[PDB]
């Protein structure tokens, strides 16, 4: 015999990894006291891609704390009830997106190449960090001719927005230069890459 599904399903954003789901049961008095053997099952998946697998959990309460979620990620949530051999279809879909977190991984695959026929110019390329934890609002490139120099003495080259390439001109020939890159998002700065070395070309004559 079929059960009516949960109603008024809501998401509460607690952190970058936790969302609280709460709902009502119209087969319970206004006060919502669970006196029965009934148990709710909560399922969730990331909104995109469409074909992702639902993760799920059981609760004896009219709320559930969903954990282990990615920062800055939008999720879909539905609930269902089971009172003994009786069960119900999945409730209305509730949506929630976890907060951003500062990046916790440095920019990946940092490379340097000399610009075509312009030896005093270089092109720097990189990849976004694995743990970006938010919409990347830019990067900061640091360069020095002394790898042992303190970060304050390193030349700051900002990169506005999610750009993965940046050209640096007016460099000195036949010289090792060192490069560190760090990512930024709305919540702050993340770790820096390990310095990559590039020696600018020499002239022939
Ligand atoms: C919820 O409980 C049912 C019955 O005990 C079980 O089949 C299901 O796997 C449970 N869900 C999880 C995530 O353990």
Curated annotation (Swiss-Prot):
Subcellular location: Cell membrane
Positions annotated with a glycan in the UniProt record: 58
Residues covered by the Fibronectin type-III domain: 5-104, 106-201
Annotated tissue distribution: Widely expressed.
Known partners and oligomeric status: Interacts with BMP2, BMP4, BMP6, and BMP7. Interacts with RGMA and RGMB. Interacts with MYO10.
UniProt similarity note: Belongs to the immunoglobulin superfamily. DCC family.
Function: Multi-functional cell surface receptor regulating cell adhesion in many diverse developmental processes, including neural tube and mammary gland formation, myogenesis and angiogenesis. Receptor for members of the BMP, netrin, and repulsive guidance molecule (RGM) families. Netrin-Neogenin interactions result in a chemoattractive axon guidance response and cell-cell adhesion, the interaction between NEO1/Neogenin and RGMa and RGMb induces a chemorepulsive response.
Comment on protein domains: The Fibronectin repeats 5 and 6 mediate interaction with RGM family molecules.
Name of this chain's protein: Neogenin
Organism expressing this protein natively: Mus musculus (Mouse)
Portion of the full-length sequence here: 883 to 1083 of 1492
């Amino acid at each position: 015999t079929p059960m009516m599904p949960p109603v008024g399903v809501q998401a509460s954003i607690l952190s970058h990894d936790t969302i609280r789901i709460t709902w009502a049961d119209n087969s319970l008095p206004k006060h919502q006291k669970i006196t029965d053997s009934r148990y709710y099952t909560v399922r969730w998946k990331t909104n995109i891609p469409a074909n992702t697998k639902y993760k799920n959990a059981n609760a004896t309460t009219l709320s559930y704390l969903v954990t282990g979620l990615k920062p800055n990620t939008l999720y879909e949530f539905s609930v269902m009830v089971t009172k003994g051999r009786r069960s119900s279809t999945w409730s209305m879909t509730a949506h929630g997106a976890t907060f951003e977190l500062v990046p916790t991984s440095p920019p990946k695959d940092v490379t340097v190449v000399s610009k075509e026929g312009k030896p005093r110019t270089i092109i720097v390329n990189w990849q976004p960090p694995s743990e970006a934890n938010g919409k990347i609002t830019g990067y900061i490139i640091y360069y020095s001719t002394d790898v042992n120099a303190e970060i304050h003495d390193w030349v700051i080259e900002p990169v506005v927005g999610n750009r993965l390439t940046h050209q640096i001109q007016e460099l000195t020939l036949d010289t090792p230069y060192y490069f560190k890159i760090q990512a930024r998002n709305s919540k702050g700065m993340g770790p820096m890459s390990e310095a990559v070395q590039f020696r600018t070309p020499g002239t022939k004559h």
